[PDB]
Swiss-Prot record:
Its main location: membrane. The modification Phosphoserine is found at S723. The chain holds residues 232 to 1726 of 1956 of the full protein. Residues 42-96, 122-128, 197-207, 260-265, 323-346, 368-376, 444-456, 511-514, 584-625, 648-663, 768-778, 833-844, 905-918, 942-969 are extracellular. Residues 2-17, 232-239, 286-301, 483-488, 537-555, 691-743, 803-808, 867-881 are cytoplasmic. It is a multi-pass membrane protein. It comes from Homo sapiens. IV repeats lie at residues 730-998. It is found in: Cell membrane. This is Sodium channel protein type 10 subunit alpha. II repeats lie at residues 163-407.
Length: 998
């Protein structure tokens, strides 16, 4: 333990400069957030003829609002008034720099950021989504890729530093190449009947599955008695894997024997472990077993440390935290319950909280433990748990990944067309038509029916567009030929899209438009943007990179599908059909009915006299192996996993109302899943990704990917920038006075005085606060005037001494820009202030933001900040290319959503600001979930299929006949997207991580 703990201390040492840089960026973004939004999360709709609010529909939070136009609107009779309290428990806000650093830490680790993004966009305005795009790319994505890329070197640095029976045996040993095949076929086929049980079986299907189970039991037991009466029972217990198969057969025998219907459904699912036998002929699953075994083997010390840390922090939490969680629980419990769901009143629950912090969900509890106990203890406990857990897990994952993996006239017309198709203006003209045709889809949104003219313009536009693209096709055919055209392999995209469009337009010619299949070809018209992939060279090179790696993804996806099949079958054994419940539903809000009225489905059928009561099911349940795959993806991505676990542990037998934590220990099912599925399948996936990328790069003679040919030239320039050590010593001035300023500014003392004065300006910035006072505002403005004068004095003194040498350097140009911006901003405020036309206050907050450049002046002497920022700049080209491809994907998916899901009812994730009725709103939701954040929130109103959730007989909204989504289409829009973004982003990581190494 000591040898490895010393290495962990070294890994903490290596975080030296990254901690500095993270603190600096977190602070700058804290000041930006504090400036722009201070006191905005306080705007809440309050009625008017104390305070009278109205809750947000389907929740109990007070409604957040705005007086702006794209900010968020109150219902009738509700004026957006700024009030005293903050949203959550008064802890999430931007009102002062300390809360601002809290919120920007929440954004760096991406814990429940989707909710803060919702709130600040709802309060200040959609346009401020530019802040989160910019603090999630720099905070979350980038500042994690510094941690992952410095731990790795610390761990590489560590490692690199160091008679009649014998006649029965005569056909006992007849195990030829055809018997083994029988065993494999039996394994697979038995798994296929285990993967075929569901909830509502009629008895006959259950009986068939039973007979099949018994047959496969006796088959494998027969195999075992054969083997024991084939070798000698001495050496039979010497092989590694025969012991495993024999323990499985004993457990199967016992489960058959002891007879209860569903008896300990873990014992009925224990057979599934047999698939691991199919690893002799499946080398990738052999490597998965190699990884797990090493995790508990040659790397046992690291997992021992991790277990020690989790046990210690669960204990400390229980002892310090626990008593007050008991009696203060009315202060953190849900509206109609009696205990909080997540608390620290016993070792299991304390461990569950420490685990959920290890997953990454570390704030939402902190608010509660601060509302129940002391605040300093909560902050220290949770934040030390977080840093230490997400450091030991990170180091263990790196170690498993690193060592364990890395062990005549016709000829003339053809020729005419042919010279023309290559001519540069021709290509650019076609690209232009693609850009307009793609962009014209964004105008086809919900409201287009009430715009009687824009529609017709778009229709004529589409007709001219099908013409123009068909003409390009025929030009390219009689240019190239039928034989070369198709072989190129980018032309098939164009031909398919053109055929789809020429089915659609013809269907608008005839009366067969509303025949459902052609109306399902039409919806495909959202792939028109995809014609852009070929024309842009950067998207082309990135697509080549991804298509080069689709094979390896396919192997690992097969292994992941088998392995999650195991857990989905366990889930169907354990939970299937028990997620149902009753709910008294009145208006938009649903509460489980107390167990003193129901306990049964045959009690909702009786107490339904009012009609509020309805018998329902959770949207993402475990009733099938199919729905089990979705519930496993939601657990493995940690989104919507909580509504799952609550009804897993509430569960009882079938047709019975669920009880408050009547299955407390089913959380072990989800813990075990996350550990094995998430941690180890992900480790396997990333291992094959790195190996693939390494060999892929090495093939090309060790050049770069995601980068074009000209990007390599820009790279040569940037690389030659950050190396040039000598610069001409500047000449000394002649004039006596122009010599003296030269003498004074050029020493080190002036630089250090200005450095510390920037720091004192920062301190003057951090005191700024919502609703402070009048006097403090005035005094801070006077002090601000003192700095803008001194920094002007600094620049003018530089100019007088260094006339042109100044304008040679770059940092001199930067602080020149910020000096002129600060003076201009003060002049702009002076004029546009109450002296002149009083526009919106919010303009003043944006104006006051020219000061933060003063802060960013600070990185001239800072080695660490400057070097890691130069690494970011070197990466930015490839980041641009993959950003282009991710943009195209977000764009296509935007139109798909905007055409398929606008009429869905407003519910959990879809409200009057984040929905799919417009290109702004749809792009908002798609960006929220590019990071997979909150995607279960949007998907939930899709799966609606009737009362109480949707009204399928609505007179208006001629869509799915009412406010209902398409469950088949949600699960494939939302699931594939987060997989495509996942694989797109993964290639964004490989860019920067391979930039830090250099
Ligand atoms: C939930 C289920 C998740 C995982 C269960 C994995 C079961 C793997 C069985 C391995 C059987 C074995 O024995 O493989 C022998 C081979 C060959 O043996 P040989 O040719 O050298 O002779 O060994 C090798 O090749 C490589 C040696 C790798 C040893 C793998 C050890 C896997 C143990 C997993 C248990 C982890 C805790 C589970 C807690 C559940 C609650
Ligand atoms: C999406 C947005 C994406 C990115 C935005 C920021 C990306 C650009 C960051 C530029 C920082 C920079 O270019 O500096 C670094 C260079 C380094 O030079 P070196 O001699 O140390 O070599 C380094 C020695 N080696 C070779 C070992 C590395 O310095 C120089 O080139 C000096 C010349 C440049 C002077 C003006 C550049 C700085 C202006 C603004 C930077 C502010 C960045 C803010 C980032 C967010 C903070 C919250
Ligand atoms: C800010 C966001 C991104 C930063 C943009 C620039 C980042 C790129 C860094 C490198 C660069 O491309 O730099 C421009 C180059 C620096 O190369 P060099 O001359 O040292 O090469 C030496 C060769 N020799 C001696 C012949 C000159 O030429 C220069 O000097 C000009 C560099 C001056 C920097 C222009 C960027 C100023 C824009 C905004 C400033 C921030 C104000 C608002 C604060 C944000 C509010 C929240
Ligand atoms: C290797 C191990 C590494 C461990 C690193 C993590 C260690 C974390 C230590 C944090 C220590 C915090 C000390 C101050 C906490 C006690 C003061 C306190 O009252 O806190 C709570 C405050 C808000 O209080 P309130 O609601 O206004 O009620 C105040 C009233 N007087 C009362 O006591 O009722 O709430 C606040 O003051 C907000 C504070 C936000 C701080 C954000 C810190 C980010 C973490 C660092 C990130 C970079 C890494
Ligand atoms: C490693 C990560 C792997 C991740 C795998 C994720 C796969 C999710 C598959 C979900 C399949 C699924 O949920 O089927 C179920 C849906 C539900 O429809 P319904 O009308 O409400 O009927 C409900 C009733 N309980 C019933 O199914 O009877 O039945 C449907 O109607 C949906 C049918 C089509 C679902 C196809 C999913 C393809 C996803 C592609 C994922 C890979 C992308 C690359
Ligand atoms: C670097 C920091 C980046 C932060 C970007 C954060 C986003 O910036 C917010 C503003 O740009 C939004 O628009 P304005 O505030 O300029 O509009 C004012 C004019 N009206 C709307 C009042 C009429
Ligand atoms: C290298 C080795 C690995 C390669 C894999 C190759 C192995 C091949 C495996 C083949 C798998 C084939 C599995 C066979 C399963 C067929 C699937 C069997 O179907 C049975 C049901 O369709 C019948 O349903 P019931 O008879 O219960 O009636 C339903 C109840 N009602 C509706 C009537 C009331
Ligand atoms: C890169 C290639 C893919 C994208 C191809 C270019 O897409 C550009 C569009 O985002 C331009 O904006 P919109 O036309 O969506 O904005 C208008 C929205 N309203 C106001 C009409 C609703
Ligand atoms: C009901 C159906 C609904 C379908 C909805 C989903 C639609 C998704 C469509 C995705 C299309 C993806 C297209 C990807 C095309 C990649 C195609 C990548 O191939 C590139 C080569 O063709 C380039 O040609 P060169 O001549 O430069 O060199 C040849 C290089 N090789 C080929 C010899 C190695
Ligand atoms: C998602 C991440 C988004 C990062 C977005 C990063 O944007 C930075 C780009 O502007 C830098 O691009 P370059 O200067 O390399 O431009 C060269 C490419 N062309 C324009 C010459 C073709
Ligand atoms: C309780 O009664 C209400 C109304 O009497 C039932 O609501 C009906 O639900 C069915 C399908 O479940 C719909 O076809 C009807 O249109 C609904 N009727 C009304 C008036 O809303 C509800 O199903 C009953 N709940 C249970 C399970 O007993
Ligand atoms: C209860 C189930 C689901 C958990 C997973 C089953 C695993 C852990 C069990 C089943 C069979 C067991 C293995 C069978 C025999 C051996 C060979 C011995 O030299 C080392 C231990 C080892 C390798 C056992 C370790 C534990 C084991 C692998
Ligand atoms: C439904 C589940 C339980 C059964 C899985 C069926 C498929 C995916 C499994 C069963 C047998 C497996 C194959 C067994 C043997 C080989 C040979 C190896 O060189 C490549 C992998 C390959 C080709 C495996 C791929 C995955 C595989 C085909
Ligand atoms: C199932 C439906 C919807 C899609 C089928 C479209 C197929 C037939 C189209 C789309 C892309 C086309 C392929 C693109 C790449 C090449 C180049 C070379 O390898 C031979 C032809 C081949 C392989 C094309 C054959 C036809 C092709 C495969
Ligand atoms: C060098 C000394 C003076 C301060 C060093 C840390 C400074 C820069 C920062 C860190 C945290 C900041 C504090 C965060 C929030 C508040 C609460 C507000 O009601 C008064 C200002 C005050 C108290 C800030 C003062 C400046 C501050 C203390
Ligand atoms: C919103 O505008 C109303 C007047 O219409 C005003 O009374 C209210 O205070 C405003 N709130 C804010 C924060 O702008
Ligand atoms: C919870 O908060 C209320 C005040 O809102 C308090 O009266 C009650 O006693 C608290 N919890 C306990 C200890 O039951
Ligand atoms: C259901 O909710 C309504 C209030 O909206 C209430 O009046 C009714 O008594 C409740 N019934 C039960 C027992 O759930
Ligand atoms: C339903 O619950 C009641 C107790 O409230 C019980 O007496 C009755 O037999 C139960 N019936 C069913 C449907 O099991």
């Amino acid at each position: 333990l000591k040898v490895i703990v010393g290495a962990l201390i070294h890994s903490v040492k290596k975080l030296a400069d990254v901690t500095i840089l993270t603190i600096f960026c977190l602070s700058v973004f804290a000041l930006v957030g504090l400036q722009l939004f201070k006191g905005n999360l306080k705007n809440k709709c309050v009625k008017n003829d104390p305070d009278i609010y109205i809750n947000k529909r389907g929740t109990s939070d007070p409604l957040l609002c705005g007086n702006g136009s794209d900010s968020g609107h109150c219902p009738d009779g509700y004026i957006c008034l700024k009030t005293s309290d903050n949203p959550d428990f008064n802890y999430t806000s931007f009102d002062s720099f300390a809360w601002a650093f809290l919120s920007l830490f929440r954004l760096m680790t991406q814990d429940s950021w989707e909710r803060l993004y919702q709130q600040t966009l709802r309060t200040s305005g959609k346009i401020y989504m530019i802040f989160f795009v910019l603090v999630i790319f720099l905070g979350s994505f980038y500042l994690v890729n510094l941690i992952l890329a410095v731990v790795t070197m610390a761990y590489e640095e560590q490692n690199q530093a160091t008679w009649v029976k014998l006649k029965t045996i005569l056909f006992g040993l007849v195990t030829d190449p055809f018997a083994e095949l029988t065993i494999t076929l039996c394994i697979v086929v038995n798994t296929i009947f285990m993967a075929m049980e569901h909830h509502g079986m009629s008895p006959t299907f259950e009986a068939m599955l039973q007979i099949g189970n018994i047959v496969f039991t006796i088959f494998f037991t027969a195999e075992m008695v054969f083997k024991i009466i084939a070798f000698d029972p001495y050496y039979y217990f010497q092989k590694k894997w025969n012991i495993f198969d024999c323990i499985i057969v004993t457990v199967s025998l016992l489960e058959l024997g002891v007879a209860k219907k569903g008896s300990l459904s873990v014992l009925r699912s224990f057979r599934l472990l047999r698939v691991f036998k199919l690893a002799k002929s499946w080398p990738t699953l052999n490597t998965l077993i190699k990884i797990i075994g090493n995790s508990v083997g040659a790397l046992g010390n690291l997992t021992i440390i991790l277990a020690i840390i989790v046990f210690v922090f669960a204990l400390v939490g229980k002892q310090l935290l626990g008593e007050n969680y008991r009696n203060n629980r009315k202060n953190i419990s849900a509206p109609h319950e009696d205990w909080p769901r997540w608390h620290m009143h016993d070792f299991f629950h304390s461990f569950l909280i420490v685990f959920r912090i290890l997953c990454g969900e570390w704030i939402e509890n902190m608010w509660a433990c601060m509302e129940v106990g002391q605040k300093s203890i909560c902050l220290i406990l949770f934040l030390t748990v977080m840093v230490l857990g997400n450091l030991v897990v990170l180091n263990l994952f790196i170690a498993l990944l690193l060592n364990s993996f890395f062990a005549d006239v016709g000829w003339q017309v053809r020729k005419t067309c042919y010279r023309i198709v290559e001519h540069s203006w021709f290509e650019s003209f076609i690209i232009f038509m693609i850009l307009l045709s793609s962009g014209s889809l964004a105008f086809e949104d919900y409201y287009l029916d009430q715009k009687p003219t824009v529609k017709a313009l778009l229709e004529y536009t589409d007709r001219v567009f099908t013409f123009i693209f068909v003409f390009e096709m025929l030009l390219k055919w009689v240019a190239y030929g039928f034989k070369k055209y198709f072989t190129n392999a980018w032309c098939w995209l164009d031909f398919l899209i053109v055929n789809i469009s020429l089915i659609s337009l013809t269907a608008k010619i005839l009366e067969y438009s509303e025949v459902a299949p052609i109306k399902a070809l039409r919806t495909l018209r959202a792939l028109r943007p995809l014609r852009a992939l070929s024309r842009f060279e950067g998207m082309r090179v990135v697509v080549d990179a991804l298509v080069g790696a689709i094979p390896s993804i396919m192997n690992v996806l097969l292994v992941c599908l088998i392995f999650w099949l195991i857990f989905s079958i366990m889930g169907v054994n354990l939970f299937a059909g028990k997620f149902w419940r009753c709910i008294n539903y009145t208006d938009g809000e649903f509460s489980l009915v107390p167990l003193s009225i129901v306990n049964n489905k045959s009690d909702c059928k009786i107490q339904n006299s009012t009609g509020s009561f309805f018998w329902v099911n959770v949207k993402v349940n475990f009733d099938n192996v199919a729905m089990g795959y979705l519930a496993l993806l939601q657990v493995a991505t940690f989104k919507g996993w909580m509504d799952i676990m609550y009804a897993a542990v509430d569960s009882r037998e079938v047709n019975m109302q669920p009880k408050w934590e009547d299955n407390v220990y089913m959380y072990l099912y989800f813990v075990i899943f996350i550990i094995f599925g998430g941690f180890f399948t992900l480790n396997l996936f990333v291992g094959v990704i790195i190996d693939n990328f390494n060999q892929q790069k090495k093939k090309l003679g060790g050049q770069d990917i995601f980068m074009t040919e000209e990007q390599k030239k820009y790279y040569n320039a940037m690389k030659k920038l950050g190396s040039k050590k000598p610069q001409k010593p500047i000449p000394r001035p002649l004039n006596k006075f122009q010599g003296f300023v030269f003498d004074i500014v050029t020493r080190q003392a002036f630089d250090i005085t200005i450095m510390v004065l920037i720091c004192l300006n920062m301190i003057t910035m951090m005191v700024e606060t919502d609703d402070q006072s009048e006097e403090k505002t005035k005094i801070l403005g006077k002090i601000n005037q003192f700095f803008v004068a001194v920094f002007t004095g600094e620049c003018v003194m530089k100019m007088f001494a260094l006339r042109q040498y100044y304008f040679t350097n770059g940092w001199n140009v930067f602080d020149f820009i910020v000096v002129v911006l600060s003076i201009a901003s003060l002049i702009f405020s002076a004029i546009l202030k109450s002296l002149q036309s009083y526009f919106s206050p919010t303009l003043f907050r944006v104006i006051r933001l020219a000061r933060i450049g003063r802060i960013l002046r600070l990185i001239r002497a800072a080695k660490g900040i400057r070097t890691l920022l130069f690494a970011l700049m070197m990466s930015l080209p490839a980041l641009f290319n993959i950003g282009l491809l991710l943009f195209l994907v977000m764009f296509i998916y935007s139109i798909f959503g905007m055409s398929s899901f606008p009429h869905v009812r407003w519910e959990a994730g879809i409200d009057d600001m984040f929905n799919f009725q417009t290109f702004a709103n749809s792009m908002l939701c798609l960006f929220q979930i590019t990071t997979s954040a909150g995607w279960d929130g949007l998907l939930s109103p899709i799966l609606n299929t009737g009362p109480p959730y949707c009204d399928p007989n609505l007179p208006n909204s001629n869509g799915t006949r009412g406010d209902c989504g398409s469950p088949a289409v949600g699960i494939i829009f939302f699931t594939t997207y987060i997989i495509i973004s996942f694989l797109i982003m993964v290639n964004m990581y490989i860019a920067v991580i391979l930039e830090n190494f250099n």
